[PDB]
Amino acid sequence: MIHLYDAKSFAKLRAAQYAAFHTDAPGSWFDHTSGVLESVEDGTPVLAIGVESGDAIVFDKNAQRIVAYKEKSVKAEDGSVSVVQVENGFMKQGHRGWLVDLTGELVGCSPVVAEFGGHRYASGMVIVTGKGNSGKTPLVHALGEALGGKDKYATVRFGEPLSGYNTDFNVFVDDIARAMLQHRVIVIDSLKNVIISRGAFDLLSDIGAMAASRGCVVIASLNPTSNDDKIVELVKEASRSNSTSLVISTDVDGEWQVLTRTGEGLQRLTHTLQTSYGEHSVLTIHTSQASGKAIQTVIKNDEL
Amino acid sequence: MIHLYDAKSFAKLRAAQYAAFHTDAPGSWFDHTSGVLESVEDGTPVLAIGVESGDAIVFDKNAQRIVAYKEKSVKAEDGSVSVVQVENGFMKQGHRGWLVDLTGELVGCSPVVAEFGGHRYASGMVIVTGKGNSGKTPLVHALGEALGGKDKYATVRFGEPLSGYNTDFNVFVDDIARAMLQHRVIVIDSLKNVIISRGAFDLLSDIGAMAASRGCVVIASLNPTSNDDKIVELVKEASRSNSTSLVISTDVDGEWQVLTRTGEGLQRLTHTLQTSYGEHSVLTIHTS
Amino acid sequence: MIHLYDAKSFAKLRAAQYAAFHTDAPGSWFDHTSGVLESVEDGTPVLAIGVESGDAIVFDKNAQRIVAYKEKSVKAEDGSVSVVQVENGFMKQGHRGWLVDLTGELVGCSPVVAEFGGHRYASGMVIVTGKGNSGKTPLVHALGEALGGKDKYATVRFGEPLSGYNTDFNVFVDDIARAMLQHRVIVIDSLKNVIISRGAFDLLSDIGAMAASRGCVVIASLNPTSNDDKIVELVKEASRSNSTSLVISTDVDGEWQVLTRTGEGLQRLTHTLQTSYGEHSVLTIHTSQASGKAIQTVIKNDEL
Amino acid sequence: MIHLYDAKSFAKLRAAQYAAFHTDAPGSWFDHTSGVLESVEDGTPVLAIGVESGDAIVFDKNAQRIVAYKEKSVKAEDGSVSVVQVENGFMKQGHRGWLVDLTGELVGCSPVVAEFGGHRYASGMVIVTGKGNSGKTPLVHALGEALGGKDKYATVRFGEPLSGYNTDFNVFVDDIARAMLQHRVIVIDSLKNVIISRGAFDLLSDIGAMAASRGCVVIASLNPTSNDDKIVELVKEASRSNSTSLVISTDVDGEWQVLTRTGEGLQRLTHTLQTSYGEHSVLTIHTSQASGKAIQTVIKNDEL
Amino acid sequence: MIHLYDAKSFAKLRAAQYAAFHTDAPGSWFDHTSGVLESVEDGTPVLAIGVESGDAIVFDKNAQRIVAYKEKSVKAEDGSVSVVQVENGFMKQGHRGWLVDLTGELVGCSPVVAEFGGHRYASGMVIVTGKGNSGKTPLVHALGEALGGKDKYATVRFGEPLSGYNTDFNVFVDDIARAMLQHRVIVIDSLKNVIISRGAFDLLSDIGAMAASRGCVVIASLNPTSNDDKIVELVKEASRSNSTSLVISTDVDGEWQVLTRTGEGLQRLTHTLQTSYGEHSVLTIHTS
Amino acid sequence: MIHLYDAKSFAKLRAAQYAAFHTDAPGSWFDHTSGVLESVEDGTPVLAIGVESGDAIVFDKNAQRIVAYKEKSVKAEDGSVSVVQVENGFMKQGHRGWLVDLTGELVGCSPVVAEFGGHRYASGMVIVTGKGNSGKTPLVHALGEALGGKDKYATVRFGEPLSGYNTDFNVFVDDIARAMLQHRVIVIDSLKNVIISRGAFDLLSDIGAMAASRGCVVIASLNPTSNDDKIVELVKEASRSNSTSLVISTDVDGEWQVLTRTGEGLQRLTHTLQTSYGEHSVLTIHTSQASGKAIQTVIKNDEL
């Protein structure tokens, strides 16, 4: 909905957003939204996501797909009303995204999802990319385990010519919806194929907000494979504007750079990671500042 | 409708337009359209805006969506007639924009919406863009608070990978319609996606006129993300063409340039703005 | 319809076309077509114009829209037959343009619409463009008043972010149809937005002939805004082939160049205009030859 | 249909094709096909042409449109069968082009349509183009009158911002069908607009064969207006492959070059024309060899 | 269908393919498929080819179009099954190409279609193209007569602005299907338009295999009209890829180069041709 | 489905994946999946593949096409449910790919399919390409026989202007489905034509995963024919991201380079092959290390 502000209310918002990343306890936001979801009336639609065609499928708090649901409206303080209606397995009325309020009026945050090696990591979407020798697959799995901490991380596999890999986009969005409804740390191996169908386009522009709202982190690998300037720019765009955080390889082997957006209008931070391989290519992340928008695009032409 | 003129009537129009920006009391136009809107019968369609598909949804004076409305025509002096029909949640007959006359025959204005730091600002749409380090988000919020003055400003959020951000275009136009119906100062953070679906195209070419007619100001940030090349001249200009006013960053950090169209065929004015950050990235616009 | 000729009949046609611009009394053609329109059977379709979708709406001699009209045919001397049928507010049979004969066999003319400052101006469409400091809006209004002479000129406003401006294409074609049915001098402020939907394309290629046939003049402003070579060429094309006359700014402030097509196969003439601003930006046009096709395109790359 | 040949039958065909242009009496082929058309059963479909949408309308020998016609088949010596069926004003079964045999087994000709100034001119389609000062409109009218000789020539007007000009494509194909059914010499002023909808594409690739089959000549003006390489190549293509003859302007004022295809597999001939203007821009063509395919494209880059 | 192989069966296949071009009697493959086609029940679908829209029409062994045909399946050794159903003039079930087995398990051949001037020519599709003065039309007709030998050659005319030329794609595929069903040597003058509608795309990718299976040769002229730039390498190559053989003009007038694919995985042969004109532009191919 | 991991479970997965290629007995994975397929309830859908239009056809364990099958669901441990429904010969509910679990939780492998000349070869898809004199057809047949070993290899022929070649895409996917259901070693001669319709696009992104899951190898030839940078990049993409292994020609006659992905996140290996021709062009492969991602793209510009 829309929000109204004056100098005072705005200043409070910024302070709260700042705290959501810098001081709140890592993962507390995720736990809180888990609570909100559990308190739902059962059978109540909570998440809508687009399939290949552009239509949307809906799920309940238990990641179970809803096939039929009679029109129902809800009026917010905004005075605005939201309507949800599912017919024959597809949304007839409503919008893509969370169908239940998880954020209240605390919007524009990058809720801290975890802490590792002395650094705080944001929830939302993290694209792991770059052009070079450093492999993205080992990195996403190492980051998943590290941010998972005490918890296991969920792995969504898509579009790779390996055994057991799903290659159907609609099964893909199904795996993603379930993962965000049930886990704090999610790894998507290969944003390839996607990034174009309406579903792929919707996913690319929806996933970050969905994840940040839940307080979970989606770690997706993306190889700037094709050097075709039409998609090379689609990679730099996805990385630039559709990601909450970015993890890119450097010219030094095993070294990665992490660029993270700490919140609406807040500063973008950066830190470095060193890594090394163990047996069977298992990667380990070793454990022992702002970057202008100009320095940011300097990082972007790396993908070019 | 169409208007007829001779040298005399034209001269009067130009004088009236000039006054609408230069001498009228800041925000008086908004108050006047508020009065007109309040006089509508309730359930009577007042605003129609396009959704993603190109279809249009309709609202009453209370920002309530109209699902069903039997055909109804209205004849003007122009001799022309307007018709409005809503069926199953979508407009069957009518046009996009205000469905009620707010402007009378005073058209082609950039009604003054506020005065700040010694400068008068126009209503309509204001695009804040440019390439560089100066952040657009802090600027639109600072501008919203300053132009809001004694009133709070409304914030419409869209398309950013942050918590609580709506990314569905249809919810977006809904937020925008409600905002223009109820507030004088509106901030849209991120005109992404738009600038393309038919809805996005309709929005870009309708919003400025809708806002100027109401007397409200829509302050929208637009990052020339697509490319970092001096293609920033692309979205710009295209911005300058569908905007009542333009606010672009300069090569000096914290400094911005304001270019404003004072009216139909009138002079385009320009002034500079100096700014600085406080705690938690709150931006402040200096005033002489 | 089609016309047959031999050396003699052709020579007569050219002489008549030449007179329609050079010797006829300014505005006489308009008065004549006004007469033909008034003699129509009432309720009889006289004008058809395309809406955004590509369909067409129809009007009667009083600029009133026709919603229902049973099939009716008419056979010309050409032996050919025209049919008109309106159903549910849209043309079911017929063509875009004038549905009644206003020109007889006198075709291919640029009927003189007015005289001012010692120059004759043609009816049809006039595009006012150019890239520079000189503003198009003040010029179109000054030209409207001047060519209007004793009569007022009509103003159609479209697609500008100012108060009271219509931005819906279908309302636009409605204003245009009514203007051409009722006035001799018409100003269209902003051909922007248009110039692409089927309606916009139809309008661009129909309006000049519609206006020239009626004997009215449509003065439209067009800023070569975007420097995107795909539409910059659409501007040079519209100006080159879809305009009866062209008014372009020069490198000297306040100075404009008028290029006018005097008729089918006739010479394109050119003259200059000097202007100055009064109070509230009101512009005034001060009052005190052929141009090859090569010199013509030299004028075109100005827009490039 | 398909034709079978051996050395002897092939040699006869070539001799006959050669005669159809070089020795037959000018205009005799037209007279012959007029005879074939007059002997048709009345109400019998003879010509089908595509409208904007891609559908086709049908006409009888009197240029009258056929709205309903029950399925009817005809078996040729080829063993193949042709079927024609019109329903609700549109062809339901059949093909675009002549629906009646006018050529017999004498195919691949460029029937001489007329003789003037000591040169034989071919029937089929003639595109008058080139980039320069020389005007196409005066040239097509002068060529129409000259080739018309004792007969008047028909003029089809389309897409120009002048009085009385039709701008609706469907009315345009209607005028063309009627013209080819009733006259030997036809002038089309402005192939602009066309040259893209399915109808425009069909017209461009059908008209030459339709005209050559009838023995009539269609003289069409085409300005290489837009210097947009996507249509500049569409102009060089239309001129190169869709025209029976080409008439292009040169770098010398008033001079034109005529390139004509004399028949299937035969030599392309070329000759020059000198012209001058009289009163009211009436143009006159004054009256007192093979060109390789290489020299031909050298003529083409003139349009580029 | 799919075929299985081991070193031995594969070696035999390659030997058979080699013989199909190098040692078999010229034209024997055509005669053999003629025999097979003649053995079909009549009214039984044998050929399916695509029309402009992408749909397909069906013909019997007599080149008669099949309007209605109730479903009927056939199981092979492969275990796979083929189905054919025609409804209202169009194929409802089936595939494009030959609907009857002509080749047996001898696949991947370029069956010799004729011998002339000391060279063996392959059946299948032959594209005649290139940039330059040498005219394609006279060459395809001369080649048709020479390969026809004792038999006349069939000529399919399409898309040229000359008298009696069909310009409707659907009539075109009809002429082509009939030609391949009834003749060994076919000439197509102008593969215009094609090289795009679905029908044109299907034609380009089907015709070569259809012709090679039958044992007939389709000689098509293709003018790289679109552009005169060295883009003649575009249509070419693309020609070389969908053609069994290529005939391209050289920089010496009257001289042409013949590139022919002798079979699946076999060597591509090349030889030169000298030619000259007689009366009325009749072209003659010199023979040593 | 999605899988959860912690350091320990992840390490076990990597060890198992490593073994699936390096130590398991060549072809054992294929034999195992053959077993799983034979245990299916008969008439039970096991494979779905896309046809030209984008729709999908379904097969049973005997490579027989399923035309009708009433909705049936299955719940996995993931909690997620899969549904399959076939109506009128096309899938109404379900996804493309294997409709039965063949991999269990052992995902992301490149199951060894065979061993030859001292090298292990992976299952999945192998694209044989490169630009040069070395012919792809003789190489795919030699590799088919070699990897086939004691078993015969299956050959799918498509889109070549030779006798007996199918050129209809839908018959093509039918041959491929049957081949993967019944044989370990498959050769596809010509991925030309494909690599664009929805079916072609689906095939390109599905086949590798389908094959790796079954444990069979699909050896496909692909000539980088057209030097049109829009498809030349589609070739480098298909080779780079849609292949489990790549076999490319070098600048030395008869020599080829084999690049193989050994598993999810594992190292890409490379070795060389020497070959020579016998009689009738029968090719023989003579029988007597990691390559960075940088060296990998250096191999890619060969196709450019």
Q: Is F301 known as a binding-site position?
A: yes
Bridge partners, E220 (sequence order): E127, E188
Distance separating alpha carbons of residues A3 and B222, to the nearest angstrom: 20
CB environment F140-158: b (16+ within 10 A), e (fewer)? bbbbbbbbbbebbbbbbbb
Q: For domain D6-41+104-304, give its CATH number from 3.40.50.720, 3.30.9.100, 3.40.50.300, 1.20.1050.10.
A: 3.40.50.300
| Tokens, residue B284 | 């402040």
User: Alpha helices of chain A — where are they, by DSSP H?
Assistant: 7-22, 28-38, 136-148, 169-182, 198-214, 232-241, 293-300
In this structure, what are the phi and psi dihedrals at residue A76, rounded to the nearest 5 degrees? -95, 175
List Cα–Cα distances, B238 to B115, B198, B270, C186, C194, in angstroms. 27, 17, 18, 27, 14
Collapsing DSSP to helix, strand or coil, C73 comes out as strand
Query: Would the CB atoms of F167 and E244 count as touching at under 8 Å?
Result: no
Name, in order, each residue with C-beta under 8 angstroms of A267's C-beta and a sequence gap of 6 or more.
A290, B281
| Tokens, residue E86 | 């025609």
Closest among E255, E220, E242 to E144, alpha carbons compared: E220
Q: Looking at beta carbons, which residues of chain F come within 8 Å of E14?
A: 279-282
| Tokens, residue A71 | 């029109």
- Give me the residue label for tokens 């108050």: B31
Distance separating alpha carbons of residues F304 and F302, to the nearest angstrom: 5
Q: Looking at beta carbons, which residues of chain C come within 8 Å of D252?
A: none
CA distance F191 to chain E (A): 12
Domains C6-41+104-304 and C42-103 share a fold: no
The dihedral through the CA atoms of A283, A288, A290, A292 has a sign that is: negative
Distance separating alpha carbons of residues F76 and D259, to the nearest angstrom: 76
CA distance F242 to chain E (A): 23
Task: Map chain F to HEC letters.
Answer: CCEEECHHHHHHHHHHHHHHHHCCCCCHHHHHHHHHHHCCCCCCEEEEEECCCCCEEEEECCCCEECCEEEEEEECCCCCEEEEEEECCEEEECCCEECCCCCCCCCCECCEEEEECCEEEECEEEEEECCCCCCHHHHHHHHHHHHHCCCCEEEEEECCCCCCCECCHHHHHHHHHHHHHHCCEEEEECCCCCCCCHHHHHHHHHHHHHHHHHCCEEEEECCCCCCCCCCHHHHHHHHHHCCCEEEEECCCCCEEEEEEECECCCCEEEEEEEEEECHHHCEEECCCCECCHHHHHHHHCCCC
Q: Looking at beta carbons, which residues of chain E come within 8 Å of F168?
A: 95-97, 206
Q: Looking at beta carbons, which residues of chain B come within 8 Å of C148?
A: 6
Our CA dihedral for A16, A21, A27, A30, rounded to 10 degrees, sits at 50
- Show the beta-strand stretches assigned E in chain A: 3-5, 45-50, 56-60, 65-66, 69-75, 81-87, 90-93, 97-98, 112-116, 119-122, 124-129, 153-157, 185-189, 217-221, 245-249, 255-261, 268-277, 283-285
For F165, nearest residue in chain E (alpha carbons): E209
Query: Would the CB atoms of B162 and A212 count as touching at under 8 Å?
Result: yes
Distance separating alpha carbons of residues F229 and D299, to the nearest angstrom: 31
Distance separating alpha carbons of residues E195 and E235, to the nearest angstrom: 8
Closest among D166, D34, D174, D169 to D111, alpha carbons compared: D34
Q: Are chains D and E touching, using the cut-off of 8 Å on CB pairs and a minimum of 3 such pairs?
A: yes
DSSP letter for each residue of B28-48: HHHHHHHHHHHTS-SS---EE
Q: Is A193 known as a binding-site position?
A: no
Collapsing DSSP to helix, strand or coil, D200 comes out as helix
Q: Between D135, D163, D226, which is nearest C237 by CB?
A: D226
Q: Between D9, D205, D297, which is nearest E193 by CB?
A: D205
- Show the beta-strand stretches assigned E in E130-267: 153-157, 185-189, 217-221, 245-249, 255-261
Say what the resolution is, in angstroms.
2.5
Length of chain B: 288
Q: Looking at beta carbons, which residues of chain E come within 8 Å of D209?
A: 159-167
Name, in order, each residue with C-beta under 8 angstroms of E238's C-beta and a sequence gap of 6 or more.
E195, F225, F226
Q: Is D70 known as a binding-site position?
A: no
CA distance A29 to chain F (A): 21
Tell me whether strands C3-5 and D153-157 are parallel, antiparallel or unpaired.
Answer: antiparallel
> What is the CATH superfamily name and number for domain B1-41+104-288?
P-loop containing nucleotide triphosphate hydrolases (3.40.50.300)
Query: Would the CB atoms of A282 and F125 count as touching at under 8 Å?
Result: no
Side by side, the strands of the sheet bearing E56-59 are E56-59, E47-50, E97-98
Burial class (CB in 10 A: 0-12, 13-18, 19+), B104: exposed
Q: Between D161, D174, D226, which is nearest C244 by CB?
A: D161
Q: Looking at beta carbons, which residues of chain F come within 8 Å of E103?
A: 163-164
| Tokens, residue A40 | 């739902």
Method: X-ray
Q: Between B144, B163, B281, which is nearest A266 by CB?
A: B281
Distance separating alpha carbons of residues B261 and B269, to the nearest angstrom: 7
CA distance C134 to chain B (A): 11
Closest among A215, A25, A218 to A111, alpha carbons compared: A215
Distance separating alpha carbons of residues F102 and F214, to the nearest angstrom: 7
CB E160 within 8 A of CB D212: no
Q: Looking at beta carbons, which residues of chain A come within 8 Å of B171?
A: 95
Query: Would the CB atoms of E162 and D244 count as touching at under 8 Å?
Result: yes
Q: Which chains touch C (3 or more CB pairs under 8 A)?
A: B, D
For B126, nearest residue in chain C (alpha carbons): C161
Q: How many CB atoms lie within 10 A of CB D303?
A: 20
Interface test with D, best of C1, C2, C14 (most D CBs within 10 A): C2
Bridge partners, B119 (sequence order): B116
The binding site of E for ATP comprises 136-137, 223, 261, 268, 277, 281
CB pairs under 8 A between C and D: 145
Q: Looking at beta carbons, which residues of chain B come within 8 Å of C178?
A: 2, 78-80
Q: Are chains F and A touching, using the cut-off of 8 Å on CB pairs and a minimum of 3 such pairs?
A: yes
Q: Residue A283: CA atoms inside 13 Å, Cβ hemisphere, count?
A: 25
F281 residue type, one letter: S
Query: Would the CB atoms of A133 and F109 count as touching at under 8 Å?
Result: no
**Domain boundaries of chain A, sorted by first residue:** 6-41+104-304, 42-103
CB E92 within 8 A of CB E204: no
Q: Between A148, A152, A282, which is nearest F14 by CB?
A: A282
Closest among B162, F2, F107, F105 to A181, alpha carbons compared: F2
CA distance F297 to chain E (A): 26
Q: For domain F42-103, give its CATH number from 3.30.70.60, 3.40.50.300, 2.30.270.20, 3.40.190.10.
A: 2.30.270.20
Q: Is A136 known as a binding-site position?
A: yes
- Give me the residue label for tokens 């100066």: B134
For B64, nearest residue in chain A (alpha carbons): A80
Query: Would the CB atoms of D155 and C2 count as touching at under 8 Å?
Result: yes
In this structure, what are the phi and psi dihedrals at residue C180, rounded to the nearest 5 degrees? -70, -25
